[PDB]
Specification:
By secondary structure, the chain is of the alpha+beta class. It has helices at 24-37, 70-82, 152-162, and strands spanning 9-12, 15-18, 42-45, 60-65, 86-88, 99-102, 121-124, 126-128, 166-168. It is globular, with a radius of gyration of 18 Å. Bound molecules: potassium ion and magnesium ion (4 copies). The structure holds one RNA strand. InterPro entries: Ribosomal_uL5, Ribosomal_uL5_C, Ribosomal_uL5_CS, Ribosomal_uL5_dom_sf, Ribosomal_uL5_N.
Amino acid sequence: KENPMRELRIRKLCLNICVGESGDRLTRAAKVLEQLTGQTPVFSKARYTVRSFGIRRNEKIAVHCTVRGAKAEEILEKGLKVREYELRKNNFSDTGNFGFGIQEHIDLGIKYDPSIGIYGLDFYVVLGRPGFSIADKKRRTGCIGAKHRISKEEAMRWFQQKYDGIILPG
RNA sequence: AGUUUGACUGGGGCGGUACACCUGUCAAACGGUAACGCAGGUGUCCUAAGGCGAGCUCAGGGAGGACAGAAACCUCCCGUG
Ligand SMILES: [K+]
Ligand SMILES: [Mg+2]
Ligand SMILES: [Mg+2]
Ligand SMILES: [Mg+2]
Ligand SMILES: [Mg+2]
């Protein structure tokens, strides 16, 4: 009934880890993303100086990576397994894309190394349909259109159908 | 001993600089147009903040995401500036 070009699918998984300050902590956090994603992470500087958070401007504060393709799908199932395939409905967003956070990186895949820290990580998957790339395109870029957009309700079905997930009322 | 001891100025002095400049206004829809008219600014700064090319999009807001809270970072959407 539905067109094959309307099928929902994962655009990117967008792992992010934010630490307080630049230092060995950030470098070891970068290795944490590198081992999980098999991919070189990128550091993010602080936009402003905040004395309360003890961060200075243009200081490396966080490390983040974007994972696409089958690699993203395999990372998502590990993280969902940490949350026992149970996502709260507030986590799903109005734009049609959801995210969850994992407190401990060590539990899934990677053995703890004494050099490596105890860092957790942040998941935010972006859900898309075929043809969403027209917005990114340089030539003749355009908006996707209302019917082709993904709603919060559609994302919730996708989790409930693909991962037999449970959306708790929270 | 010789000489000098600025100017403008609702008298002079004191105070200010309207004494060389720049923006808006006055200013009466070309331009020009005065008051010690009004609101301000200048004696600098920059091997890049100069010159090309390329690639991006900004302020702000909404919705999401471990520690994270009104603000740390990540993601999507709106966004004529
Ligand atoms: K005029
Ligand atoms: Mg005189
Ligand atoms: Mg005239
Ligand atoms: Mg005129
Ligand atoms: Mg250009």
